[PDB]
Each structure stands twice: as C-alpha cells, then as structure tokens.
Structure 1
Amino acid sequence: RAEYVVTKLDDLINWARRSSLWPMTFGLACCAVEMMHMAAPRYDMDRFGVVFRASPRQADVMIVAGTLTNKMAPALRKVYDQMPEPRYVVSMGSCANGGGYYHYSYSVVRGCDRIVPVDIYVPGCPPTAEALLYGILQLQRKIKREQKLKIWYRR
C-alpha cells in the first residue's frame, strides 16, 4: 500500500532532520558553560551530528540557556522569527523554564514559554551536560515520532 512507502518516506525525512540538528545557542548566563562542557570531548556534541554553533539563519534547533530579561525578549523573538521552519526550541535551566531564582523579579520573564513555544524542558541550576544531552536525544525522538506525510495523505 501507499501507506508503507509513505511511512518509510516520513521515517527517512525524520532521520535526516534528527541526525543533522544544528543549534542556535542563545546563551545568556551560567546555563551555557554546561553547553560548552557538552561540546567538549567527554560528551562531543558534534558526535551525534549536532554542530558546535552555527548561524541563527541556517539553524534547526534553538537552545535558550539562562535568564531571559524584558530587555532581551524582543531579540530572542526576532531570532525565533528569522529562523527557518521546521524549527525546534529547547529550554535549558530553571531561569528559562520558570524564571528560577529570579521568578519574583521585575526584569525577568517567568518562562521562555511566554515569548516562544518550547518542545523540551531541561531542569537544573545548572543541569549537567549529561542532562542537556538527554534532553536533546528526547527531542530527537520527538522528531522521529512525527507523521507529517501521513496526515497530509489521510486528509
């Protein structure tokens, strides 16, 4: 059936999109040294296919790492808009998950999920590079579990 080949086509597209993840590392604060340590040898970001840091204009995933303020939210939103679909976002840290240690402040956004839509939340202050890697692989699986062509076919 066409269903078989369509499933295989979606699987191939998702394999590519998940094996060639390129991150825009919107690194604001002390949840970025861990991303650096994850690129470092012991974890070798580049080993799964995730380049160290590419340009925000040809990137696929976007890692929000650290406290997002009300003076920095518009630039993050502009970057998200400039980014090309299909684009995914990963929130690394308490600061970006809910504001964290500054949630009750006047110059902090209580969650990057108010400025942009998020796919994977990584908890920690800071979360080890191992946890960030776990989260990126969780994103890989979230991608592998897509059915775009199937939903366009049975429409």
Structure 2
Amino acid sequence: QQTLPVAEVAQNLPKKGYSPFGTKQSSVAEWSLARLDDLLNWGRKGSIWPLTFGLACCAVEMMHIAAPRYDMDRYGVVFRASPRQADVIIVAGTLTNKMAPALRKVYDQMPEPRWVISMGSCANGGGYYHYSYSVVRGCDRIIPVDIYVPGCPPTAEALMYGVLQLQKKVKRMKTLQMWYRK
C-alpha cells in the first residue's frame, strides 16, 4: 500500500480540488473539453438511477438504503422499475441458470452508459452455492461488472460505499479527452 500521509507531511500538501484531471491543461481546447467532461461527469454522478433488480436476500439490505437511516435519495440514487429509465443495475442476489437469459435481456435493454454493481457473494464468485448444479458461478460470466460489494448480506454502509466508489468511477470517466486524443 501507501502509508496515509502524516499531518506534518499533509499540511505541506496542497488541496486536491474537485477535478481529477486538474486545471493545468495546456491547450485552451483541451481545457474546455476537460471542463465539459467534468460537468458531464458531475451530471452523471449527481443522479444515478439504479434498477429494481432484487434476486435474493441481498435485496433486503438494498431496501435498507432506501430506509430512512441511510437514505440513498440524497446521493442522486432513486429506484426505477423500467430498465430504460435506469442507469445502474444492482445484481443483489443469486443468479441461477433459469435467471441468466432474463438478466442478460434486462441488461441489454438498458441504455448505455451502463454501470453494474455486484451485491453479495452470490452475485460475484458464486458464493455459498458455488458448487451447485443450477447456480451461475458469479454474474461476471454474463454481465460486465464495475463495482463488486463484498459482504454476504453487505451492511448498508458497505453497499453505499460501493455506490460512492461507483460515483468516483463516474467522476473519473474520460470521454471528451479521449475523443480529442482519438
């Protein structure tokens, strides 16, 4: 790892700023595309709409970020039932062999950009039914997954930590800078 910086060292460090790219771009067109990508990523991270895809027990914790203690609504996060209106699909439960074409069709009808959160050990790696005859060995064999939330029923702080990690990934998305360098 790295040691987290001591406050004597960290007082000499300057402020990071909001932009992961920095304001030190050379060209004015590159700087304008950087700020446009910053505004676009702020709009995308300011409201991600996850889809009501609750397969198994993990989803009982998924409603617990809907719950008044954790309150996902002040993070841009609000559930949508239709897959067209939703940004994120949260695979929260056990993907089985009869569940595989349904999950693939629901993911394919979702419009791009598409970030996928694997909630729980049945969602990533198979988990407690990994050696079962009718359980897919994780959802990574079917749906491409950006965030993997570890706990068997993830606490709801850990699922919301996965949500904040997805927001940091969305804030780190480089589209217009790649277009300028394509």
| Fold match by TM threshold 0.5 | yes
1:29-48 residue CA offsets vs partner (Å, 9 max, x unmatched): 10001010111011111111
Query: Gapped runs of 5+ residues in structure 1?
Result: none
From 80, 85, 90, the equivalent of 1:58 is 85
1:116-141 residue CA offsets vs partner (Å, 9 max, x unmatched): 10000001111111100000100000
Q: Is contact 2:119–2:154 with CA below 8 Å preserved after alignment?
A: yes
Instruction: Give the CA RMSD over aligned residues.
Output: 0.8
Matched-pair identity in %: 82
Question: Highest Rg: 1 or 2?
Answer: 2
1:73-106 residue CA offsets vs partner (Å, 9 max, x unmatched): 1000000000000111000000011111100001
Query: Gapped runs of 5+ residues in structure 2?
Result: 1-27
TM-score, length of structure 2 as denominator length:
0.83
- The alpha carbon displacement at 1:25 in A equals 2.6
Q: Is contact 1:22–1:54 with CA below 8 Å preserved after alignment?
A: no
Give runs of aligned pairs for residues 27-106 of structure 1, distance below 5 A.
27-106=54-133
Aligned partners of 1:118 and 1:21: how far apart in 2? 16
TM-score, length of structure 1 as denominator length:
0.97
Aligned partners of 2:62 and 2:46: how far apart in 1? 19
Determine if the alignment matches structure 1 residue 25 to structure 2 residue 33: no
- The alpha carbon displacement at 1:154 in A equals 1.6
Higher helix share: 1
The structure 1 segments of at least 4 consecutive aligned residues displaced by more than 2 Å after TM superposition are none
1:47-93 residue CA offsets vs partner (Å, 9 max, x unmatched): 11111334211110110001000000100000000000011100000
Q: Which structure would you say has the larger RCO, counting Cα contacts within 8 Å and 6 or more residues apart?
A: 1
Determine if the alignment matches structure 1 residue 14 to structure 2 residue 41: yes
2:117 partner amino acid: V
Question: Does the residue aligned with 1:117 lie in a helix, a strand or coil?
Answer: coil
